[PDB]
Amino acid sequence: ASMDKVFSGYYARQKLLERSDNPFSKGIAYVEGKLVLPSDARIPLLDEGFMHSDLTYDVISVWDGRFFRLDDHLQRILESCDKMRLKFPLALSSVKNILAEMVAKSGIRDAFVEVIVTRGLTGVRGSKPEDLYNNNIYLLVLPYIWVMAPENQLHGGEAIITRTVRRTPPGAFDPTIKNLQWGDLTKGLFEAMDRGATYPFLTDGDTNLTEGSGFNIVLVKNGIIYTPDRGVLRGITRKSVIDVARANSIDIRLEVVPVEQAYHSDEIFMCTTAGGIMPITLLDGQPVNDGQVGPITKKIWDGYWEMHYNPAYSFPVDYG
Amino acid sequence: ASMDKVFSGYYARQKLLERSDNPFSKGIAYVEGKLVLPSDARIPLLDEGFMHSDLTYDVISVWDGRFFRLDDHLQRILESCDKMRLKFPLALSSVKNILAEMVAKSGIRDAFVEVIVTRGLTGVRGSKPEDLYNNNIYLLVLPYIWVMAPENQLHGGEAIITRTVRRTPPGAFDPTIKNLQWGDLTKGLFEAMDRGATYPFLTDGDTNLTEGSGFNIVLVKNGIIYTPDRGVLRGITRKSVIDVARANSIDIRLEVVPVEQAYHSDEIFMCTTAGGIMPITLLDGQPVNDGQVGPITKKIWDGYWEMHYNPAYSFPVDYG
Numbered sequence: 001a002s003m004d005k006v007f008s009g010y011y012a013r014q015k016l017l018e019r020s021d022n023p024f025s026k027g028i029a030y031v032e033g034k035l036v037l038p039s040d041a042r043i044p045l046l047d048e049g050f051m052h053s054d055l056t057y058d059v060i061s062v063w064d065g066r067f068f069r070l071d072d073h074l075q076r077i078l079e080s081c082d083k084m085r086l087k088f089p090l091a092l093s094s095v096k097n098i099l100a101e102m103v104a105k106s107g108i109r110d111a112f113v114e115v116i117v118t119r120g121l122t123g124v125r126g127s128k129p130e131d132l133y134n135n136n137i138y139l140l141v142l143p144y145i146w147v148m149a150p151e152n153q154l155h156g157g158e159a160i161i162t163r164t165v166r167r168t169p170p171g172a173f174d175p176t177i178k179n180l181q182w183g184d185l186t187k188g189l190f191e192a193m194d195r196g197a198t199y200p201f202l203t204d205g206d207t208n209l210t211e212g213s214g215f216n217i218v219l220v221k222n223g224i225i226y227t228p229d230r231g232v233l234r235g236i237t238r239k240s241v242i243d244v245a246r247a248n249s250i251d252i253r254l255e256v257v258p259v260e261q262a263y264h265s266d267e268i269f270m271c272t273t274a275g276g277i278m279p280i281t282l283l284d285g286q287p288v289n290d291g292q293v294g295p296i297t298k299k300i301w302d303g304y305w306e307m308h309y310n311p312a313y314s315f316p317v318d319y320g
Numbered sequence: 321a322s323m324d325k326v327f328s329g330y331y332a333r334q335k336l337l338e339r340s341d342n343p344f345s346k347g348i349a350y351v352e353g354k355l356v357l358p359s360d361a362r363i364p365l366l367d368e369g370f371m372h373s374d375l376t377y378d379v380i381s382v383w384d385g386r387f388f389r390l391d392d393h394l395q396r397i398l399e400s401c402d403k404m405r406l407k408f409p410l411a412l413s414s415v416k417n418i419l420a421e422m423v424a425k426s427g428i429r430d431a432f433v434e435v436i437v438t439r440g441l442t443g444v445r446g447s448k449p450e451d452l453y454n455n456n457i458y459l460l461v462l463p464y465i466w467v468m469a470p471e472n473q474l475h476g477g478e479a480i481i482t483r484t485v486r487r488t489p490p491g492a493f494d495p496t497i498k499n500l501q502w503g504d505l506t507k508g509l510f511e512a513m514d515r516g517a518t519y520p521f522l523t524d525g526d527t528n529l530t531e532g533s534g535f536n537i538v539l540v541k542n543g544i545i546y547t548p549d550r551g552v553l554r555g556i557t558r559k560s561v562i563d564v565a566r567a568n569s570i571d572i573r574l575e576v577v578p579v580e581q582a583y584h585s586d587e588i589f590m591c592t593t594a595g596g597i598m599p600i601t602l603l604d605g606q607p608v609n610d611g612q613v614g615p616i617t618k619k620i621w622d623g624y625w626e627m628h629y630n631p632a633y634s635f636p637v638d639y640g
C-alpha cells in the first residue's frame with residue numbers, strides 16, 4: 001500500500017487490542033490438546049525438542065485479520081518433517097482449523113503464529129510401542145513480532161558481515177529444514193551488539209553470503225536483485241519478493257552471492273515473516289550506497305504488503 | 321575393576337532398586353526450585369532453551385553410590401556458561417548439595433545426572449545484554465544410561481565413519497561448549513541405523529575424525545593412543561583415559577587424527593560418562609584389526625572403573 005497506510009492501520013488495530021479484556025489478547029498456545037495462555041504453557045522436560053533440539057518449526061503471519069500464505073508454510077513444514085524423518089502429527093485441514101480458532105479466540109488481527117514439531121518422547125520411550133508420543137506438536141499465537149520495527153523501516157537498519165561466526169553448513173544441518181538450533185545465529189546477534197550494529201549477515205566461511213538471525217538477505221545492484229541460492233532457508237518472504245520482482249519486470253537472480261558484492265550494493269534489504277521487507281542502510285558501519293532506502297526496496301515493500309490482501313495468497317480469519 | 325566385578329555389582333544393585341517402592345526410584349528432577357517426577361517434569365514453552373536451544377548442559381555419573389568427577393563437570397559447565405554469556409544461576413556449592421540430596425532421595429546408586437542452564441525467558445534477539453542474565457537451571461537424575469550396554473562391551477560394537485553428515489564446525493558453534501544442538505549427531509545416528517551399524521563417527525568434512533553422538537573417539541596403534549584435539553568436547557571420560565594411560569606409561573597423543581588412521585587401528589574405543597569405555601570391533605562393516613577387544617582398551621577400562629573408588633576423583637553419597 002504505502003509505508004504510512006500499512007503502519008497506521010497496524011497501530012490503530014494495536015490500540016484496540018491493548019484495550020481488550022480478553023486474556024487471550026496477549027496470545028494463546030496449544031499443548032497436549034489444550035488451549036492455554038503462553039506464559040502458562042508447559043512442555044515435557046523429556047521432550048526431544050528440548051533434550052536434543054530434535055524438532056522443526058515454521059512461522060506464519062496474520063495481517064489485518066488475514067492469514068498470509070498459510071498453505072506455503074504448511075507445505076514447507078511437511079517437507080521439513082520428511083527431511084527430519086518426523087511425522088507431522090495433525091492433518092493439515094485440522095491444523096488450519098485449530099490455528100484459525102486460536103487466532104479468532106485471541107482477537108489478534110496482526111499475529112505471529114508458530115508451529116513446532118518435535119521427536120516427542122522417542123528417547124525415553126524407546127522400549128515402548130510406536131504411538132502418539134513419538135511426534136509432538138505445539139502451536140503458538142502471539143501479537144505480531146517485528147525483526148525491524150515500523151519506525152526503523154523508514155530509514156533502514158545497521159548490519160555487519162559476521163567475523164566471529166559462520167553459518168552451520170548444510171553437511172552439518174540442512175538449512176532448508178527450518179530449525180531452532182540457533183547456536184550460530186545467536187552468536188551472530190551478540191557479535192552485532194558487540195560491534196554496535198543490529199543485524200548479523202553470516203557467511204559460509206567460504207566467502208559467500210548466507211542468511212541472518214531470522215531473515216534472508218537480498219542485494220540490489222544496477223537494477224537487478226540478488227539473493228543466495230544455497231546454505232539458507234527458502235523463505236516464504238523471499239518467495240514473495242520473487243513474485244513481486246517478476247510482476248514488476250525486475251530481474252531477480254538466485255545464485256551464489258559473494259560477500260564482496262554487499263560492499264558495492266545499490267540497496268540491501270532483509271526479508272522475513274516477522275516484519276516483512278526490512279531495509280539495511282548501514283553495513284560494517286558505512287553507508288550502503290547513499291545511505292537511503294532505495295527505489296527497488298520500496299517497490300518490493302509495496303508489492304509485498306499488497307499481496308496480503310490478494311485472495312490467491314491470503315484468507316480472512318472468522319473472528320465470530 | 322574387573323569386567324564381570326563392575327557389571328555384576330551393577331546388576332545386583334539394579335535388582336534391589338527395581339524392588340523399591342520409593343516414588344523417586346525411577347528418577348527425580350528439580351525444576352523451578354521444586355522436585356518432580358521425570359515424567360511429570362515440565363519446562364516453560366517460552367524458555368529459550370526450547371525456543372532457540374539457547375543453553376549449555378553437562379552430564380555426571382554416580383557409580384556404586386559415588387559421584388564421579390563432579391567437580392570437573394561443574395567447572396566445565398561454568399566455563400561453558402562463560403563462553404555463552406550465561407550466568408550460572410545457583411552457587412556451585414548449592415548445586416552440588418542439591419544433586420547429592422536428589423540422588424539420596426531417589427535411592428539410586430548408579431545414576432545419570434544432567435544439569436541444563438538455559439538463557440531463560442527473554443531471547444537474545446532485540447535485547448540488551450543486561451536483560452539476558454535471568455537464566456534458568458534444570459536438574460535431572462535417572463537410573464544410569466548406557467551408550468553401550470554391559471553385555472555389548474564384552475565383544476565391542478559397530479561403528480561407521482559418517483558420509484551423510486559432518487560435525488558442526490567450531491566457527492558455527494564451539495564444540496567445547498557442551499550443547500544439545502544435535503542436528504548433526506542425530507542424523508549420524510540415523511545414518512548408522514541405515515547402514516546396519518550403531519555408532520556414528522563424524523568427520524570434520526576436511527578428512528579428520530571428530531567425535532560421535534555422545535562420546536569421544538580413541539584410536540590405538542602400535543601401543544600408542546590417539547584422540548582428536550580439536551572440533552570436539554574435552555570429555556571428562558577422555559581426561560580420565562589420559563590419566564589412566566599416564567599411570568600405565570602408555571603414550572597418548574592429542575592431535576589431529578586423519579580418518580584414514582581409523583582403518584588401520586589395532587584397537588578403537590569410544591568414551592563417555594554414560595557407559596565409560598566402549599570398544600568398537602567393527603568399522604564400516606569390517607573388523608577392527610582381528611575383531612577382538614584389545615589389550616590397551618582393557619587396561620583403560622580397568623583403570624577407569626578403579627578411578628570411581630579413588631577419593632581424588634569421587635565421593636560417596638549419603639543415603640541415610
Ligand SMILES: Cc1ncc(COP(=O)(O)O)c(CNc2cccc(C(=O)O)c2)c1O
Nearest residue numbers: 059214215216233235236237238272273274
Ligand atoms: C534462518 C532464517 N532464514 C530465513 C528466514 C525467513 O523465512 P520466511 O520468509 O519464510 O519467514 C527465517 C524466518 N524465521 C523467523 C520468522 C519469524 C520470526 C523469527 C524470530 O526469530 O522472531 C524467525 C529464519 O529464521
Ligand SMILES: Cc1ncc(COP(=O)(O)O)c(CNc2cccc(C(=O)O)c2)c1O
Nearest residue numbers: 379531534535536553555556557592593594
Ligand atoms: C558430543 C559429545 N562428545 C563427547 C562426549 C563425552 O563427554 P564426557 O566424557 O565428558 O561425558 C559427550 C557426552 N554426552 C553425553 C553423556 C552422557 C549421555 C549423553 C546422552 O545424550 O545420552 C550425552 C558428547 O555428547
Ligand code: NA
Nearest residue numbers: 132133135136
Ligand atoms: Na504427540
